[PDB]
Amino acid sequence: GGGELFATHCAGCHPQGGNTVHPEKTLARARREANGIRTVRDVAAYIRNPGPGMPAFGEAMIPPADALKIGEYVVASFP
Ligand code: HEM
Numbered sequence: 001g002g003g004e005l006f007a008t009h010c011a012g013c014h015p016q017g018g019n020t021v022h023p024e025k026t027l028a029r030a031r032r033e034a035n036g037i038r039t040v041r042d043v044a045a046y047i048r049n050p051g052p053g054m055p056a057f058g059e060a061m062i063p064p065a066d067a068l069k070i071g072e073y074v075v076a077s078f079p
Contacts, residue, residue, distance in 0.1 A: 027078040
């Protein structure tokens with residue numbers, strides 16, 4: 001499940017869709033979209049080449065199908 005993948009790999013730094021490292025860059029829809037992360041595929045692609053301070057999630061670690069599940073959970077969970 002997308003929710004479980006998020007809890008495992010992302011919730012530590014993005015609890016409830018926030019950001020413990022860079023306060024301004026939360027997962028809230030308006031914030032992420034202002035930075036070009038709008039679609040499920042945008043989220044999936046972003047984790048492979050993220051911004052400073054965020055570890056990169058390669059395809060070997062998180063296969064395409066799972067990256068999409070994470071994206072599906074992110075867009076629906078954080079308005
Ligand atoms: C696969 C799980 C994760 C997802 C889905 C995710 C997703 C995102 C997204 C969409 C953004 C906003 C990008 C922007 O607006 O420019 C972001 C930013 C960020 N994430 Fe994550 N993240 C994940 C895991 C992590 C982890 C584990 C950490 C903490 C070690 C982390 C730290 C950050 C930081 C520091 C930023 C700011 C990057 C910058 O300053 O450009 N993220 N993340």
